[PDB]
Amino acid sequence: SGRDYEDELQSERDYVAGLYARLDAERAQSQRRYAAALREHGGTAVERDAEVRALAKDIARLNVADNGLCFGRLDTLDDARLYIGRLGIFDRDNDFEPLLLDWRAPMARPFYVATAANPENMRRRRQFHTLGRKVVDFTDEILGRPTGAEHDATNDAALLAAVNAPRGEGMRDIVATIQAEQDQVIRLDHTGVLVIEGGPGTGKTVVALHRVAYLLYTYRKQMERHGVLVVGPTPAFLDHIGRVLPSLGESDAVFMTPGDFVPGLHVTAEDTPEAAEVKGSLKILDVLKAAVADRQELPSEPIPIDLSDVTMRIDAETAKWARDEARKTGLPHNEARAEFVDVVTYVVTERAVARIGRGWLTRDDKHAWEKMRADVVGELEDHEQFNAALDALWPILTPEDVLAQLYTSHERLRAAGAPECLWRADGEAWTVSDVPLLDELVDLLGRNKAADEAAERERREEEAYAAGVLDLEQDNRELSERAAADREWTYGHVVVDEAQELSEMDWRLLMRRCPRRSFTIVGDLAQRRSPAGARSWGAMLDSYVPGRWVYKSLSVNYRTPAEIMAVAAAVLAEFAPDATPPDSVRACGVAPWARQVTDDDIASAIAEFVSEEAGREGTSVVIGPPDVPGTVPPSETKGLEFDAVLVVEPERILADGPRGAAELYVALTRATQRLGVLYRDALPQALAGLA
Known part of the structure; x- marks a missing residue:
């Protein structure tokens, strides 16, 4: 300033x-x-x-x-x-x-x-x-x-x-x-999938953005009408990106998180528990396919037909035959209702005319068309029982209801190969892990025709009655908005920061979004807070890009001091150690510190940090468990940086999760100049480095 x-x-x-x-x-x-x-x-x-x-x-x-x-x-x-x-x-x-x-x-x-x-x-x-x-x-x-x-x-x-x-x-x-190193990442000619797994203190996000600029200029002719989809863990980080994002000339980005991959709803990270780790996995597909078949319910009691002379014609034989044939075409559920009805009506008209009408003694011109037609029609109009019956057998359904009628019943669940740790009281407390299950379901169920015709009809006669009833466009919205309002959108490039927090199904969605496979995946596996995770990249990618993805690294650290990071080295010298020191340089002149708090002399201590940092001109966000007021968790600082950082209660957040020390290693590191800790009585003993 x-x-x-x-x-x-x-x-x-x-x-x-x-x-x-x-x-x-x-x-x-x-x-x-x-x-x-x-x-x-x-x-x-x-x-x-x-x-x-x-x-x-x-x-x-x-x-x-x-x-x-x-x-x-x-x-x-x-x-x-x-x-x-x-x-x-x-x-x-x-x-x-x-x-x-x-x-x-x-x-x-x-x-x-x-x-x-x-x-x-x-x-x-x-x-x-x-x-x-x-x-x-x-x-x-x-x-x-x-x-x-x-x-x-x-x-x-x-x-x-x-x-x-x-x-x-x-x-x-x-x-x-x-x-x-940066040059190598940016001036690289792969136009495919690149991974920039580095670590903290090396600017991997800015590098990824420069990379995207290079690509969107170079290949501004295949792109420039597709977009740039940039997902992230939090809208704070997404606004940060939008704020230091290069030109993208005459193109437009679309920011997202895992949680808003769906058109319309914005899940606020409810984070269904660790058993949902079976949702961040492709086996779940079977479950869906097995939960979308338990909806083709078979009649146990024979359904009564009352077409003025005819006996109930549909029963386990008929419904079984029709469901088998409908599954015997290879296409979605709501488009398969068509074959179900075709077959039931076929076998309830051709096999009811020659029985209940009168019988035999006419082989043409009466059996072929006339009773054929009458039975057909009398059946097609029975929107009371026949159609209610079908909707009872082959229900036209939607993604937003299957997860609910499945996560609760406990019997439909068992009929899907599904486990029982995914049962919850409310069937619409939609979480992050059941978003990609809603985008996958629109492609198994698809979209019918009859209902859409009737619906747009009624809509037309509703917009025509409001103004005047005698019946007998150009919005060129910007790219971001035309896109985000469509899941049937193919981007031209995709950035993904902190991409270890994603699941097999998430990448399945993304790779259904970009078929050009022009991703710019960023991340660090050892900064993961998710029980679906990666634990390695080839796991999730070889299924989509085998042998055709590049892995570049960023080994040096300059945005995060060497002192602040000597401790996080040991905090990461656990967990099947790896190259945990990214050659920390930029030795500062301030060493970190600690302070032993009593039960509730706690706010009296964070307020000092706060009101002195106010005396500075740099961001000073504090991190802590959720219970404490005035301090945020370590999961919204996922991919940010600050000037001075204060983490309080290392141990509650360490033990908060199966991989909670990762949240700690994340939070000790968002800083770039100064760091302080407040420990109640004891340390996790990997923090003796602080004095």
Whole structure:
């Protein structure tokens, strides 16, 4: 929040004001020539129409360009400013010297594809954060070595500069190694599935976003009409992403979590318990298929038919035959009602005419059509018993009700190979783990036709009666909204951060979303808090992308101090240890600390932290168990960073779960400058490092 930043912000605001002025003037003269061409134009009708349309396209392009004109700027090594935007603005006076580049130019390229190790000729890159016409703030991104940069929104520059480590080979001058790793991730040519499993303190999310920018520019022609689906653990993290997200020029993202994969409902992480780990697994499919067959109930008592002469014709033989044949076509349930009814009616008309009507003595022209027709019709209209009977046997049903009629009955459950740990009182306390079971069910059940016809009919005669009854579109919503309102959407790319928190069924859904398999999976298995988890990547991916997925890593740590992380090393030296130290560098000058609390001198101690951090200018979120007030769990800080962090009661949160020490290792690490702990009486003994 310095002063030089204010100077620069005002300068850039002035420049963008000038650009908007020129845009206003071009709209002015274009509307003027438009009015003119419209009135007379002098010439011919076809020339007139052509000029009209051309000026209309100009008007529209400029109108749109009013919303976030300048994306950012480039400073090259020869000190030549470049300004990037969604519109090219040149000065007709100085030989068309670019005042604003279009991002689609071969000269605005070192803004999507330039790194700090393979730049093109650049020294810097700025992004501007606009609302509609105003430059709120900006962020520099130096393509080289930083010393101190006023504002970045991620402070990467001041951390990349405070790297104090022993002289020597020193991992090849720490900075260069980080930059080259990032370059490898971003300038990579796979256009398929990449994994960036790294760890804490290495900027894997920013790297993934730069990667997505590189891809959406390079292949902006297969994408640019598909989107970028970015899932995440929490909307806080998703807004963070949306806030430091690069251009994605003329494309649009769609943010999500596990919980809103469905059109319409936004589960607030009810988190059905660990037994639902059998839901984050593909075996469950059988259960669904077995719970969608127990709905083809077979008649035990014979259903009475009363077509004015006919005896009850449907019974275990008839229903069995029809259900078998309906299962004998290979297609959904609600579209299979068709064959069920075709067969029941076939065997209740052709096999009731020659019995109950009169009998035999006519082999044509009466049996074939007439009694055929009468029986058929009298049956098709019986919307009282015949149709109620079918709805009793072959019910037209929906995903939102099967889970409920299954998770409670305890008999339909047993008839599905299903276990009994998934039983719960309410059948609509929908959790995160039963979302992908609702998106999978719309594809087993599908969608009927008859009901839809009748429904839209009634709807038509309801919109026609409200206004006037004698009966006898263009909304071009933006990409995000046209997409999120459709599960039958195929994106062109998919980012996934903290992707270890997902389940086989989640990836099944995602890979049904992106068939191009252009994911950018981020994560760290050892930061997992989920009993469906990964425990390895090949598990979930080889089933979709075998041998065709790349695994890149980010080994160095610079965004998380070396002191804060020496402890988390031991906190992770448990759990079948792995490369737990990502070569921590950036030794700070502050060591962490501790404080022994009494029963309820607790708020009197967190308030000190809070009101002193208020004296700072950095985020200071506190973490703790749910019972305590004023402190949040460690599961909403899943993929964020803060400036100073205070975790209280390490042990209750450690024991909170089967993998709770992972929540602790997560929470000791969100910090980047300072960390404090408050322990009641005893430590988990892996925290002696704190004093």
